[PDB]
Amino acid sequence: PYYQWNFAPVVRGIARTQARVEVLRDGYTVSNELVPSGPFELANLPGSGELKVIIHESDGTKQVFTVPYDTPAVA
Amino acid sequence: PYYQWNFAPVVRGIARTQARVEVLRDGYTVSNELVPSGPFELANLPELKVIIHESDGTKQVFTVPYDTPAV
Ligand SMILES: [Cl-]
């Protein structure tokens, strides 16, 4: 049994109210997590390209962002 | 919002039967869970002491060294 160095990808941000954070790829919804207000960290996600992150807030407001992603080469 | 890569190390090993694996980080119990026979990974953990109790009642204690890269 051994200790292994792994690197997991996450997307971090801030939610205004307590919200639903949706992660889209190419139109396809991949993540969907309800979070408390403030900072959030989204584990479990799908190379390189772009994600779309919508923060559906309690009052019906949608904070929409484009999140560029990339997988780094490791020796 | 931004994409980022977190250092997320794991303790890997092979359990012969449906086992219980306990991981100690210097005295404190850090992980204790039941695993099926075959390979196992232990994620999201707060030298390590890894104890593998197996179905037949046999137990082995391993000293697994751990390190964190400097950034
Ligand atoms: Cl929508």
Provide Rg for chain B, Cα atoms.
Answer: 14
Strand residues in chain A grouped as ranges (E): 2-4, 7-15, 19-24, 29-35, 38-42, 49-56, 62-69
Q: How far apart are CA A2 and CA B19, in angstroms?
A: 17
Whether the CB of A6 is below 8 Å from some CB of chain B: the reply is yes
**Minimum CA–CA partner of A66 in chain B:** B1
**Sheet holding A7-15: strands in order across?**
A38-42, A7-15, B2-7
Q: Inspect the interface and report whether the beta carbons of B1 and A8 lie closer than 8 Å.
A: no
Q: Is A25 left (phi over 0), alpha (psi -120 to 50) or beta?
A: alpha
Chain centroid to CA A53: 7
Fold of B1-71: Immunoglobulin-like (2.60.40)
**Minimum CA–CA partner of B67 in chain A:** A3
Whether the CB of B28 is below 8 Å from some CB of chain A: the reply is no
Residues of A in contact with B7 (CB under 8 A): 5-7
Strands A62-69 and A49-56, bridge-based pairing: antiparallel
Whether the CB of B3 is below 8 Å from some CB of chain A: the reply is yes
* Closest by Cβ to A6, choosing from B8, B48, B62: B8
User: Which residues in A5-43 are b (16+ Cβ under 10 Å) and which e?
Assistant: eeebbbbebebeeebebbbbeeeeeebeeebeeeebebe
| Sequence letter at residue A24 | L
DSSP B47: -
Question: Residue A30: CB partners within 8 Å, gap ≥ 6?
Answer: A23, A24, A45, A46
How many other CB atoms are there within 10 angstroms of residue B38's CB atom? 11
Q: How was this structure determined?
A: X-ray
How far is CA B36 from each of CA B10, B16, B63, rounded to the nearest angstrom? 17, 9, 22
Residue of A58, A72, A33, A4 whose CA lies nearest to B1: A33
Residues of B in contact with A68 (CB under 8 A): 3
How many other CB atoms are there within 10 angstroms of residue B31's CB atom? 17
Whether the CB of B4 is below 8 Å from some CB of chain A: the reply is yes
Residue extents of the structural domains in chain A: 1-75
Q: How far apart are CA A36 and CA A38, in angstroms?
A: 7
Fold of A1-75: Immunoglobulin-like (2.60.40)
Provide Rg for chain A, Cα atoms.
Answer: 14
